[PDB]
């Protein structure tokens, strides 16, 4: 992770003000809406017919939290992302069957979500920093694909 000290810091500081419950839900939520193809993997969550259902869907929200929760742990392991997500990786590949191409989609949806909640405070430099984490996190997740 080629994160600059002043970048690591830009990242860390902003995360600390994040409402995991709201951001998680809106991320996973927006992914299913903006990139419906990703619904294929969640058919068991229920009514995914309309934007309103998705964002209101409790199973969606809860998972958004679980997802953003695992992200958080990576932010604390930035130096060894590969090792931190190895399990999650074997799992997304060996049991879930998710094309790692989708990771990126979530990564960008997420970046939008932060920019949506923090407005001015989500400045270009800070975004770049996050764009780096989102990629880093995506590669770690695809790391053990075989």
């Amino acid at each position: 992770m080629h994160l600059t000290p002043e970048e690591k810091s830009a990242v860390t500081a902003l995360w600390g003000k994040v409402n995991v419950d709201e951001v998680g839900g809106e991320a996973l939520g927006r992914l299913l809406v903006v990139y419906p193809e990703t619904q294929r993997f969640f058919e068991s969550f229920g009514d995914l017919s309309t934007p309103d259902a998705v964002m209101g869907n409790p199973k969606v929200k809860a998972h958004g939290k679980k997802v953003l929760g695992a992200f958080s742990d990576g932010l604390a392991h930035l130096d060894n992302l590969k090792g931190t997500f190895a399990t999650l990786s074997e799992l997304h590949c060996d049991k879930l069957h998710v094309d790692p191409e989708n990771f990126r989609l979530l990564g960008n949806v997420l970046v939008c979500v932060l920019a949506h909640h923090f407005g001015k405070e989500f400045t270009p430099p800070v975004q770049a920093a996050y764009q780096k984490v989102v990629a880093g996190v995506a590669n770690a997740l695809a790391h053990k694909y075989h």
Binding site: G29, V33, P51, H116, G119, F122, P124, P125, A128
Partner: protein, 141 residues
Amino acid sequence: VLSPADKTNVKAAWGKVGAHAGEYGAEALERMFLSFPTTKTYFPHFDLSHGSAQVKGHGKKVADALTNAVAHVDDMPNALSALSDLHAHKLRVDPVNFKLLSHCLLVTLAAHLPAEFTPAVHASLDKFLASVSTVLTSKYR
């Protein structure tokens, strides 16, 4: 493909943008250069420092081409005929780079228009820009 609801979501979202268009264009451009550096290779003749005259005016052009695309949402290939010849025969920008601008626009928008960046608009906006990308690369080969 753009549905009538999308076309309507786009017209609204962009309507609120109003006189801040160029300012958002420049911002997206900046966001892009800083976040995805490889894209700088297409502007080796530009002063790329923070908020400089070239990025600004250029961001204003991009913004205005978008305005013109919304206004002609139902006829994009014909209204963008020229920009398409330009990116395809002269600029020859690799398609990948088009997604990076779109995502940046999205971020810019999302950061400036909180109340409008609903999940339904986000979506439409995404499909919108994705189409403007195809149209701009439709004559690559």
